[PDB]
Amino acid sequence: KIRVDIWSDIACPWCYIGKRRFESALGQFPQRDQVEVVWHSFELDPSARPLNPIAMRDGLAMKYSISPAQAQGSLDHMTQTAAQEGLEYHFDRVKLANTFLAHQLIHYAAEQGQGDAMKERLLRAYMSEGQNVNDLDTLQKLAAEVGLDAGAARAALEAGTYAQAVRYDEAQAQQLGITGVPFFVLGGKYGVSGAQAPETLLGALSQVWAEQHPAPLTMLGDGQCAVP
Known part of the structure; x- marks a missing residue:
């Protein structure tokens, strides 16, 4: 079997692009059929307001200390890059929301x-x-659209059942030095940072x-210790 661990935030446009590129690789x-993908929670901003009412362009301009004109160029770049993956982004409608509960839903x-x-x-x-x-x-x-038990899923979120598991995901990411997403770990050994080309993830x-x-060795040919 091959284990792939991916850290990702719902709020990161490169994560969606990266998911597509990884799916292309797969x-x-x-x-x-021998690959097991395990998604892990990551929050770009764990302390974000429940809902920030400002435009994504402006939140980006503030967070990254550049002009609104450049922040838009970056949005335009991400939008066109996503289109090449079959993704039609609409950043002008993005709600800048805290993603903690959404990650919990993923765990459910x-x-x-x-x-x-x-x-x-x-x-x-x-x-x-x-x-x-x-x-x-x-x-x-x-959740209902995904085919989950909508009542059970909502009950889980209100209880904060998977709150701890999300924090542990993030803790694990922090302990690994993962400071940006998407981040891929393959075979519990190799790391790939960012939304890299399908070729790169395929080569990994x-x-x-x-x-x-x-490749099987050619054997040639008074004892040994063997583990039972």
Whole structure:
């Protein structure tokens, strides 16, 4: 088996792009059926307001200390880059929301085996559909759309059941020195930082598989100690 651990935030447009590029890599990888993907929570800003009412362009200009004109250029760059992955972003509608609860929903979804579908739904909701992913009504609806028990999912969020697990995900990311997303860990050994090309993630997948299935030695030929 091949384990891939990915840290990601719903609020990061490169994460959605990265998910597509990784999916492109996976499709080209002969041993794709032996890959287990595990999504991990990451928050760009764990202390963000529940909902910041300012335009994404402005939040970006403030956070990164540049002009509104440059912040827009960056938005325009990300939008066109995403389009090449089949993603139609709508940054003008983005709700700058705290993503803690949304990550919790992903953890709930994963216990039902629907982690990736939930992650996908939420990325779309944030990046394209102008939805507020800190809002419980919205989160419950999205869960229903994924095919989850909407009542159970909402109950889980109100209880904060997966709150601890999200914090541990983030703690683990911090302990690994992961300070930006998306971040890929392959074979619990190799790291790939950022939304890298499919070729790069395929080469990582390929390199890891090779290490786990190296070419069989030719044996030649008074004892040994063997582990039982």
